Short mmCIF file of all heavy atoms in Angstrom, two decimals:
data_model
loop_
_atom_site.label_atom_id
_atom_site.label_comp_id
_atom_site.label_asym_id
_atom_site.label_seq_id
_atom_site.Cartn_x
_atom_site.Cartn_y
_atom_site.Cartn_z
N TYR A 1 97.04 109.86 193.92
CA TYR A 1 96.92 108.83 193.10
C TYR A 1 98.11 108.76 192.15
O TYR A 1 98.51 109.80 191.56
CB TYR A 1 95.74 108.90 192.04
CG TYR A 1 94.32 109.09 192.87
CD1 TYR A 1 93.39 109.98 192.48
CD2 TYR A 1 94.11 108.17 193.83
CE1 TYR A 1 92.23 110.07 193.15
CE2 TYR A 1 92.83 108.35 194.55
CZ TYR A 1 91.97 109.31 194.11
OH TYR A 1 90.71 109.48 194.78
N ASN A 2 98.82 107.66 191.92
CA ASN A 2 100.02 107.51 190.95
C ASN A 2 99.55 106.42 189.97
O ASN A 2 99.16 105.32 190.41
CB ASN A 2 101.28 107.09 191.74
CG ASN A 2 101.81 108.26 192.34
OD1 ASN A 2 102.50 109.16 191.85
ND2 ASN A 2 101.51 108.34 193.74
N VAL A 3 99.43 106.79 188.73
CA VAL A 3 98.81 105.77 187.76
C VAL A 3 99.85 105.75 186.53
O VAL A 3 100.46 106.60 186.21
CB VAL A 3 97.43 106.24 187.30
CG1 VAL A 3 97.48 107.61 186.96
CG2 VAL A 3 96.97 105.20 186.29
N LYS A 4 99.91 104.51 186.07
CA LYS A 4 100.64 104.15 184.78
C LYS A 4 99.76 103.52 183.85
O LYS A 4 99.04 102.73 184.21
CB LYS A 4 101.79 103.24 185.15
CG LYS A 4 103.02 103.90 186.03
CD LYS A 4 104.17 102.94 185.96
CE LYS A 4 105.31 103.46 186.78
N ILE A 5 99.90 103.91 182.55
CA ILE A 5 99.19 103.18 181.44
C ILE A 5 100.22 102.98 180.29
O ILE A 5 101.03 103.68 180.02
CB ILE A 5 98.00 104.20 180.94
CG1 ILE A 5 97.33 103.50 179.88
CG2 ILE A 5 98.45 105.50 180.43
CD1 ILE A 5 95.87 104.20 179.53
N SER A 6 99.91 101.76 179.75
CA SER A 6 100.53 101.41 178.47
C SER A 6 99.53 100.96 177.52
O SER A 6 98.58 100.08 177.83
CB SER A 6 101.54 100.18 178.78
OG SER A 6 102.15 99.81 177.58
N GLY A 7 99.54 101.54 176.34
CA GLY A 7 98.53 101.08 175.44
C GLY A 7 99.27 100.86 174.01
O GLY A 7 100.27 101.71 173.61
N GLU A 8 98.79 100.00 173.28
CA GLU A 8 99.30 99.69 171.99
C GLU A 8 98.17 99.15 171.02
O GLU A 8 97.07 98.76 171.42
CB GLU A 8 100.47 98.75 171.84
CG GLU A 8 100.09 97.32 172.27
CD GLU A 8 101.36 96.45 172.45
OE1 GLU A 8 102.56 96.85 172.42
OE2 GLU A 8 101.20 95.21 172.76
N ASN A 9 98.53 99.06 169.64
CA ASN A 9 97.84 98.58 168.45
C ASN A 9 96.46 99.29 168.26
O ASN A 9 95.63 98.72 167.64
CB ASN A 9 97.58 96.98 168.63
CG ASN A 9 98.87 96.31 168.53
OD1 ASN A 9 99.75 96.53 167.62
ND2 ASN A 9 99.15 95.32 169.38
N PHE A 10 96.34 100.66 168.66
CA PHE A 10 95.30 101.44 168.09
C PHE A 10 95.54 101.59 166.54
O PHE A 10 96.69 102.04 166.26
CB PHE A 10 95.23 102.74 168.78
CG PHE A 10 94.70 102.72 170.21
CD1 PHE A 10 95.59 103.00 171.26
CD2 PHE A 10 93.42 102.34 170.41
CE1 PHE A 10 95.05 102.86 172.66
CE2 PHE A 10 93.05 102.31 171.89
CZ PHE A 10 93.74 102.43 172.89
N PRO A 11 94.57 101.51 165.69
CA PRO A 11 94.97 101.51 164.29
C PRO A 11 95.31 103.09 164.09
O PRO A 11 94.65 103.99 164.61
CB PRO A 11 93.64 101.21 163.50
CG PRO A 11 92.96 100.35 164.43
CD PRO A 11 93.29 100.87 165.98
N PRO A 12 96.41 103.40 163.18
CA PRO A 12 96.91 104.82 163.23
C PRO A 12 95.98 105.82 162.54
O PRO A 12 96.14 106.97 162.97
CB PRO A 12 98.10 104.62 162.31
CG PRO A 12 98.00 103.46 161.74
CD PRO A 12 97.27 102.60 162.53
N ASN A 13 94.90 105.40 161.84
CA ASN A 13 93.96 106.31 161.22
C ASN A 13 92.54 105.97 161.84
O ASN A 13 91.59 106.57 161.20
CB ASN A 13 94.04 105.91 159.66
CG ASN A 13 93.51 104.61 159.43
OD1 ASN A 13 93.38 103.76 160.39
ND2 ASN A 13 93.03 104.38 158.18
N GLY A 14 92.45 105.51 163.00
CA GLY A 14 91.27 105.19 163.67
C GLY A 14 90.90 106.21 164.67
O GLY A 14 91.59 107.27 164.84
N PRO A 15 89.80 106.16 165.39
CA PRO A 15 89.27 107.39 166.02
C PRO A 15 89.95 107.65 167.27
O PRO A 15 90.04 108.89 167.69
CB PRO A 15 87.80 107.00 166.46
CG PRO A 15 87.66 105.42 166.37
CD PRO A 15 88.70 105.13 165.26
N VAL A 16 90.63 106.70 167.88
CA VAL A 16 91.57 107.12 169.04
C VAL A 16 92.80 107.89 168.53
O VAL A 16 93.12 108.96 169.06
CB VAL A 16 92.05 105.78 169.81
CG1 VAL A 16 93.41 106.05 170.82
CG2 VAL A 16 90.90 105.21 170.66
N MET A 17 93.45 107.39 167.50
CA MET A 17 94.73 108.07 167.17
C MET A 17 94.40 109.16 166.20
O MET A 17 95.24 110.17 166.05
CB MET A 17 95.51 107.12 166.36
CG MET A 17 96.04 105.97 167.17
SD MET A 17 96.79 106.32 168.70
CE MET A 17 98.28 107.21 168.30
N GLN A 18 93.21 109.35 165.69
CA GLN A 18 92.76 110.58 164.96
C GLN A 18 91.97 111.70 165.90
O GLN A 18 91.47 112.59 165.43
CB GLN A 18 91.92 110.21 163.70
CG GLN A 18 92.99 109.54 162.71
CD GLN A 18 93.88 110.75 162.09
OE1 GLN A 18 94.72 111.43 162.89
NE2 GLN A 18 93.93 110.90 160.77
N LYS A 19 91.77 111.30 167.25
CA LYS A 19 91.10 112.22 168.05
C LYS A 19 89.62 112.50 167.63
O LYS A 19 89.26 113.63 167.55
CB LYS A 19 91.95 113.44 168.31
CG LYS A 19 93.15 113.16 168.99
CD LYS A 19 93.78 114.46 169.25
CE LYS A 19 95.22 114.24 168.92
NZ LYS A 19 95.91 115.58 168.69
N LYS A 20 88.99 111.43 167.34
CA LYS A 20 87.55 111.58 166.91
C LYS A 20 86.54 110.87 167.82
O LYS A 20 85.40 110.44 167.37
CB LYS A 20 87.34 111.13 165.52
CG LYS A 20 88.12 112.10 164.37
N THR A 21 86.97 110.70 169.12
CA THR A 21 86.02 110.04 170.06
C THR A 21 85.36 111.26 170.73
O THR A 21 85.73 112.26 170.70
CB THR A 21 86.71 109.18 171.07
OG1 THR A 21 87.80 109.80 171.69
CG2 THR A 21 87.45 108.00 170.31
N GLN A 22 84.05 110.93 171.33
CA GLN A 22 83.30 112.14 171.84
C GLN A 22 82.76 111.70 173.21
O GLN A 22 81.68 111.88 173.51
CB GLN A 22 82.24 112.39 170.85
CG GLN A 22 82.72 112.74 169.36
CD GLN A 22 81.58 113.12 168.37
OE1 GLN A 22 81.67 113.95 167.49
NE2 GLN A 22 80.41 112.39 168.60
N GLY A 23 83.66 111.02 173.94
CA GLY A 23 83.40 110.66 175.42
C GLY A 23 82.76 109.32 175.56
O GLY A 23 82.23 108.70 174.78
N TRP A 24 82.65 108.83 176.90
CA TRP A 24 82.17 107.51 177.20
C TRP A 24 80.68 107.71 177.50
O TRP A 24 80.24 108.57 178.06
CB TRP A 24 82.93 106.96 178.51
CG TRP A 24 84.47 106.73 178.27
CD1 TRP A 24 85.48 107.61 178.66
CD2 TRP A 24 85.19 105.69 177.69
NE1 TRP A 24 86.76 107.03 178.22
CE2 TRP A 24 86.42 105.86 177.72
CE3 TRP A 24 84.61 104.49 177.22
CZ2 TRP A 24 87.31 104.85 177.23
CZ3 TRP A 24 85.53 103.51 176.68
CH2 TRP A 24 86.82 103.69 176.63
N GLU A 25 79.95 106.61 177.14
CA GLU A 25 78.56 106.39 177.65
C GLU A 25 78.57 106.17 179.08
O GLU A 25 79.45 105.54 179.64
CB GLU A 25 77.86 105.21 177.04
CG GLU A 25 77.78 105.26 175.33
CD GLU A 25 76.55 106.24 175.02
OE1 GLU A 25 76.11 106.94 175.83
OE2 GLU A 25 76.17 106.28 173.76
N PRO A 26 77.52 106.68 179.69
CA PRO A 26 77.39 106.25 181.13
C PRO A 26 77.36 104.75 181.27
O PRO A 26 76.87 104.11 180.34
CB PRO A 26 76.10 106.90 181.49
CG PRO A 26 75.85 107.98 180.54
CD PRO A 26 76.44 107.46 179.30
N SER A 27 77.75 104.23 182.39
CA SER A 27 77.87 102.85 182.51
C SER A 27 77.91 102.31 183.88
O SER A 27 78.03 103.05 184.75
CB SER A 27 79.32 102.36 181.84
OG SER A 27 80.35 102.70 182.77
N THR A 28 77.60 101.00 184.05
CA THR A 28 77.69 100.27 185.25
C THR A 28 78.68 99.25 185.38
O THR A 28 78.68 98.24 184.56
CB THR A 28 76.23 99.56 185.46
OG1 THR A 28 75.16 100.57 185.28
CG2 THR A 28 76.21 98.95 186.87
N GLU A 29 79.51 99.48 186.29
CA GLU A 29 80.62 98.42 186.60
C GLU A 29 79.98 97.33 187.65
O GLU A 29 79.26 97.83 188.49
CB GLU A 29 81.78 99.03 187.16
CG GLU A 29 82.97 98.04 187.52
CD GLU A 29 84.15 98.61 188.18
OE1 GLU A 29 84.01 99.74 188.86
OE2 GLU A 29 85.28 98.14 188.15
N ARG A 30 80.21 96.11 187.40
CA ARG A 30 79.74 94.97 188.38
C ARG A 30 80.85 94.51 189.05
O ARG A 30 81.81 94.16 188.47
CB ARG A 30 79.03 94.03 187.44
CG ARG A 30 77.69 94.61 186.85
CD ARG A 30 76.81 93.63 186.12
NE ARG A 30 76.41 92.59 186.99
CZ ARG A 30 76.44 91.22 186.55
NH1 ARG A 30 76.64 90.90 185.31
NH2 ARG A 30 76.04 90.42 187.54
N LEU A 31 80.76 94.53 190.50
CA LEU A 31 81.80 94.03 191.16
C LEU A 31 81.57 92.85 192.05
O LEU A 31 80.39 92.72 192.51
CB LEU A 31 82.21 95.26 192.22
CG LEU A 31 82.73 96.38 191.41
CD1 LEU A 31 81.53 97.35 191.24
CD2 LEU A 31 83.96 97.06 192.07
N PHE A 32 82.60 92.12 192.29
CA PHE A 32 82.41 91.12 193.42
C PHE A 32 83.52 90.83 194.13
O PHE A 32 84.80 91.10 193.70
CB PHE A 32 81.58 90.00 192.90
CG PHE A 32 82.55 89.11 192.12
CD1 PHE A 32 83.06 88.05 192.73
CD2 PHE A 32 82.74 89.44 190.80
CE1 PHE A 32 83.98 87.25 192.08
CE2 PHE A 32 83.66 88.69 190.10
CZ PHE A 32 84.26 87.55 190.66
N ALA A 33 83.57 90.12 195.29
CA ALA A 33 84.61 89.89 196.18
C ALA A 33 85.28 88.60 196.00
O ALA A 33 84.60 87.63 195.74
CB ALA A 33 84.15 90.03 197.72
#
């Protein structure tokens, strides 16, 4: 797997840039062709 990510505009004092998230909820992706 070779993967690239670009992200911007997370607020600087928010839970992403302050490392205060505690994982993703389990979820369902819906797909179609």
Side-chain angles (χ1 to χ4, degrees), residues 1-3 5-19 21-33:
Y1 304 132
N2 282 282
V3 59
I5 174 165
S6 181
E8 71 185 3
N9 293 317
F10 290 108
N13 65 341
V16 167
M17 299 308 296
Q18 288 290 58
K19 295 187 221 156
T21 59
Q22 304 182 141
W24 296 101
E25 296 285 9
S27 74
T28 305
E29 183 184 25
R30 290 183 63 220
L31 294 102
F32 73 99

